């Protein structure tokens, strides 16, 4: 798990004070973060690079 | 605030590509993209008139 | 099959960066990502039990 | 406009024959495609490239 659920909840509250987070949202968000990192790695590999940069995200 | 655990991101990267190193600013860029995903999810829920984020809003 | 007009993609790129050129493979990759965005929007609508795509599904 | 709305409609039908498309969906999809291309351009610029590749998408 790459996410801190309490910090996701706190961030959501900072955007919309009335917005709550379902337990299944955290799981779906975690899967999307994994997908972002896997895509970043594929961009770096396509370049022949062994370093991930901001521009690969 | 910061939603990601950088050590867990590093561990995940290693699980995909053992030889891949991570430039420090990648963690910050990944954090910004996760914030962007959550802000978009909030806009989807608000457009529906919901006060709860569901998996389908992501 | 193709949702994009390649000449219009090229024109848009030039409007953002006049010096930026477009490889043929970029158009194909962009087309695949647009299909992926629409498939994601369809899954959001289906999860909600809607039979219409709205702006908020994108 | 980069998208052909009739082709978007045809693609939606190919995925889900019962799914209808609101007029506002086409406009929202067009805005998201502009955002994808702007992000791709920023990735290429960050790399110091003057050509867009598949890996920039």
Author numbering:
A (entry chain B), D (entry chain D): 3 to 59
B (entry chain A), C (entry chain C): 2 to 59
How did the manuscript describe this experimental structure?
Histones are important chromatin-organizing proteins in eukaryotes and archaea. They form superhelical structures around which DNA is wrapped. Alongside nucleosomal histones, we identify a second major prokaryotic histone family, termed α3 histones, with representatives in almost all archaeal phyla and several bacteria. Face-to-face (FtF) histones make up the largest subcategory of α3 histones (83%) and are, after nucleosomal histones, the largest group of histones in prokaryotes.
FtF histones are defined by their predicted tetramer structure. In the tetramer, two dimers interact in a manner similar to nucleosomal histones, via their α3 helices and the last  ~8 amino acids of their α2 helix. Unlike nucleosomal histones, both sides of the dimer interact, forming a torus. To confirm the predicted tetramer structure of FtF-histones, we purified and crystallized the FtF histone from Thermococcus kodakarensis, which we refer to as HTkC. The asymmetric unit contains two histone dimers, that assemble into a torus-shaped tetramer. With a Cα RMSD of 0.652 Å, the HTkC crystal structure is virtually identical to the AlphaFold prediction, highlighting AlphaFold’s accuracy in predicting histone structures. For face-to-face (FtF) histones, which form the largest subgroup of α3 histones, we confirmed their unique quaternary structure by crystallography. The FtF histone, HTkC, in T. kodakarensis is part of the top 7% of the highest expressed genes, with an expression level that is 34 times lower than that of hypernucleosome histone HTkA. The α3 family compromises five histone categories, each of which is likely related to a different function as they differ in predicted quaternary structure and the presence of additional domains: face-to-face, bacterial dimer, ZZ, Rab GTPase, and phage histones. These categories are discussed in more detail below. α3 histones are defined by a truncated α3 helix, which, compared to the 10 amino acid long nucleosomal α3 helix, consists only of 3 to 4 amino acids. Residues R47, T49, and D54 form an RxTxxxxD motif which is also present in nucleosomal histones from archaea.
